[PDB]
């Protein structure tokens, strides 16, 4: 079955794509027979992946390739990294037990509903104009380099947020436990009051925004009373 599916997939290699697919097949058979938890396909110039991946792999790494889509993922997959596929506009439904999702430097228009357990989400340099609701357990969010005009409600455990280089008009309310916030080169003319509830050890970069005189002097007063580090530009 598995090896038959992979063999078929290899014989179905498009012109010039044979060696890459053979390498990938070696990797997969390694995962299957030797119980290798990590599957890295490398950059083979792959235009497609097999209908089914090794069942027991925890982590999947897909570098620069030609992939238009991804196969259904294994239920036990903890980490997924997809990068450098310019024709990939969509992710497959994500396994509920997924923790780290790094999908970046792709064409993604949207994200599928995110798994609750996800603690790390980096989707950057994509085409995203919107985000779904955020998993409550997410501690790190990098959305930068997108078309985003806004962000959805942020989780109470988020330790880092990079929204920079977007269309953002307004930020949402923030949880006091946020360590680092970088929002740069956006349209924000205003900022949420919750910003005052942050720790003085928080690193906030606001440079690249219109802001406003009212907002600027508000920021200066806040700095005077707090001692937290903030950026103006």
């Amino acid at each position: 079955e598995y090896d038959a599916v992979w063999s078929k997939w290899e014989r179905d290699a498009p012109a010039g794509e044979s060696p890459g697919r053979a390498a990938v097949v070696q990797e997969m058979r390694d995962c299957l027979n030797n119980g290798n938890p990590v599957l890295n396909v490398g950059a083979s110039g792959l235009t497609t992946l097999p209908d089914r991946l090794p069942p027991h792999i925890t982590t999947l790494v897909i570098p620069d390739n030609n992939l238009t889509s991804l196969p259904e993922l294994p239920e036990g997959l903890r980490e997924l990294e997809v990068s450098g596929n310019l024709q990939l506009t969509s992710l497959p439904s994500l396994p509920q037990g997924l923790q780290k999702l790094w999908a970046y430097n792709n064409w993604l228009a949207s994200l599928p509903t995110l798994p609750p357990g996800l603690g790390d989400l980096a989707v950057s340099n994509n085409q995203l104009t919107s985000l779904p609701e955020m998993p409550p357990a997410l501690r790190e969010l990098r959305v930068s380099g997108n078309n985003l005009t806004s962000l959805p409600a942020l989780p109470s455990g988020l330790q880092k947020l990079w929204a920079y280089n977007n269309r953002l008009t307004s930020l949402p309310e923030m949880s006091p436990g946020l360590q680092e916030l970088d929002v740069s080169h956006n349209q924000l003319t205003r900022l949420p009051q919750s910003l005052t509830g942050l720790s003085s050890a928080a690193r906030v970069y606001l440079d690249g925004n219109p802001l406003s005189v009212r907002t600027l002097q508000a920021l200066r007063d806040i700095i005077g009373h707090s001692g937290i580090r903030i950026h103006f530009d």
Binding site: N125, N165, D182, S184, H185
Partner: protein
Amino acid sequence: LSRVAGLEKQLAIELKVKQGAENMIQTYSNGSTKDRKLLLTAQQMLQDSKTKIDIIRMQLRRALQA
């Protein structure tokens, strides 16, 4: 700080480049077989600029610690 200003300038430049690339992509998205290569180039450029911004920004965040 010395390097901060320069980093910010690099940011302005690469941001301009990014804007340009975006506009190119928007112009060549008509879907004509002739503009295909121009479109792909525009994309690769957009991605390049964004990555460069990421990196330069890592360096910038470093420079703001003192």
